[PDB]
Amino acid sequence: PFFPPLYLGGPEITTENCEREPIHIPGSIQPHGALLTADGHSGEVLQMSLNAATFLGQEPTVLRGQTLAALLPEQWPALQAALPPGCPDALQYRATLDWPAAGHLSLTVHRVGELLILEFEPTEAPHALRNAMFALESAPNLRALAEVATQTVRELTGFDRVMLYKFAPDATGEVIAEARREGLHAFLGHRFPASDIPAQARALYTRHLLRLTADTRAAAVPLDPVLNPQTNAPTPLGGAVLRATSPMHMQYLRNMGVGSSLSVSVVVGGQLWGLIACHHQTPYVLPPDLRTTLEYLGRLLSLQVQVKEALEH
Amino acid sequence: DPLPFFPPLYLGGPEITTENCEREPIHIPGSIQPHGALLTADGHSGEVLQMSLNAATFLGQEPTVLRGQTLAALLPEQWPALQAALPPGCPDALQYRATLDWPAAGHLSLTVHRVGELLILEFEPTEPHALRNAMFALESAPNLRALAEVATQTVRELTGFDRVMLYKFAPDATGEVIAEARREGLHAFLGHRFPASDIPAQARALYTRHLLRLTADTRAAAVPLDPVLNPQTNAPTPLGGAVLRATSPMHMQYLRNMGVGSSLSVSVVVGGQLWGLIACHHQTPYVLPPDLRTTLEYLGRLLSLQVQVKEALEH
Ligand SMILES: *C/C=C1/C(=C/c2[nH]c(/C=C3[NH+]=C(/C=C4\NC(=O)C(C=C)=C4C)C(C)=C\3CCC(=O)O)c(CCC(=O)O)c2C)NC(=O)[C@H]1C
Ligand SMILES: *C/C=C1/C(=C/c2[nH]c(/C=C3[NH+]=C(/C=C4\NC(=O)C(C=C)=C4C)C(C)=C\3CCC(=O)O)c(CCC(=O)O)c2C)NC(=O)[C@H]1C
């Protein structure tokens, strides 16, 4: 099972008890965006991120009483239809708000039980994803596929290091491809132990396919209240992208000199086959539309990985 | 019985009947549909070899001035990118896409692929989160039928076609409409099954490699290539990879009896085999711009993944 979260008085994590930290309920978000939680029937704002006022331009109390109906007039019916009660929590709906305070905000929503979870991020507004698509499909073999993948992500994103990391039967990992800026250590062809990705994370990532950490020195921003009023229990945030990262992982990233990280699941036959992993040496907020392209590449790559191992076995 | 291709009409081959369908060489019609323009050019030197007769009106240049320059002089910014994305020896399914600003014709969608030592270049006029939301809605479908229904309804909402079907093949190559989303007043095709000779066996081999094709006007005349034969070889030009390829006149007649003016279709390919077809009908002529087609090409890949995922939850 899991320990209780810190903010509920559970034990601090060490390298003895990695497999039991409760990552999906850290009660906080990364600061490049804002998070609200709302009631699925009334649309009543229940929890908000302490930085909401920044992105939404709203007096702190005004929000925690208001309703999505009133708060997002055009979006609120779309949310009802898009996310019916009973739908999986992996289902996301996104729209773009041309919001008064901040030019354009990206809105992504999904439902956990009776709770909707809204995330707000700055956004903006050609053929590389189509070109990348055919380039993945014309690769002769798994090795060539892997090199095209990492190189494509690197040209689309500018990350300093993009690796394709591949799982072995006993959760042992290996870097089979890597595109990187000049002058970095090379992680190509290395293997790492199975505890580097603990079992409770491996389950979450077969379900939700993208996660990121935009700044490894930034402090988390708490939800308020931290417990869901509906349940007086921790809000599950496993599916939110703004979800705050475990401090045990952020400490490992600083020991490496990494300012920003992103990763994408490659799920083959209902099992996590590997990851597209991105390093950057400095902080880096990847804009939602660009992330969506990596989301597409994850499904493309997942399909082609199966095609290409089939022509070996 | 499977039989090898007739020579094309313009090399003295016979005309086609219900008796010799599987023998029409559909990959070398020697012509394009008129809503765009097609050039061919030597893979290495860049010399322009063939062009469709209509290429003057889409590119605003005399045919002889166009043929007298190399791609390095006609598309200076694109030629080096053309060389890097389509190296010699690469498969003919590998495509490269770029948008152009052309003086006379506005914004131009350039799609390139290579066949042998020949670069084929197609030019078409080109013009929020629907795809992303569509992607998530496809993956949360409980089951195959739900998935079929979401897919055909998404595709209609994105294109507006009168009738969008998901057509699934059986082991003996018969087919059955397993889902459709159609316009009020149209008669359903849901549940009908059709014989194996409705898609002949030379077309099934073509449709596993190239994944999307379309007829924009069932009543337009084809636009010839000029010259019709490749000066490289004095053999016909492989146009099998070209979305601008003109359609067999046999199939264009079947559609006019149906009252159909426009046709599009996307292959769903599973385990290296053609699992089925996303098929779209329209009663009037109808041209879908290339960036919109790209969204359909993405969905055809996503659906192929999702179908496997759904079938494996089924034993
Ligand atoms: C006592 C627990 C430890 C631990 C926990 C932990 N690790 C993750 C996530 C990841 N760890 C990864 C391992 C690597 N990243 C690299 O860059 C390299 C080498 C180049 C390795 C071997 C990876 C790829 C992830 C994925 C997450 C991501 O995208 O960054 C978590 C999950 C945190 C969360 O879900 O919020 C946790 C709890 N890691 C250890 O090394 C031990 C000390
Ligand atoms: C003697 C040859 C005949 C023939 C030729 C032919 N047919 C195709 C391609 C297709 N035929 C299809 C059949 C149907 N279309 C429909 O709308 C329905 C029912 C709703 C059916 C049963 C389909 C789906 C295709 C694929 C292409 C498309 O969807 O438009 C070809 C290939 C054309 C080419 O690649 O250039 C050919 C040569 N059809 C016959 O029925 C016989 C008489």
Swiss-Prot record, chain A:
Changing H249A: 100-fold reduction of chromophore-binding activity. Residues 141-305 form the GAF domain. Changing M248A: Binds PCB (in vitro), but difference spectrum is altered. Residues 20-88 form the PAS domain. Contains one covalently linked tetrapyrrole chromophore. Lacks the cysteine conserved in plant phytochromes (at the position of Met-248) that binds chromophore. An engineered sequence used for X-ray crystallography forms a thioether link to biliverdin through Cys-18. The natural sequence can bind phycocyanobilin and phytochromobilin in vitro, but the identity of the natural chromophore is unknown. A tetrapyrrole binds at C18. Photoreceptor which exists in two forms that are reversibly interconvertible by light: the R form that absorbs maximally in the red region of the spectrum and the FR form that absorbs maximally in the far-red region. Also has a slight blue shift for the far-red maximum. Could also absorb green light. May participate in regulating pigment synthesis like the carotenoid deinoxanthin which could protect the bacterium from intense visible light. In the N-terminal section; belongs to the phytochrome family. This is Bacteriophytochrome. The lineage of its organism: Bacteria, Thermotogati, Deinococcota, Deinococci, Deinococcales. The gene is bphP. The chain holds residues 7 to 321 of 755 of the full protein.
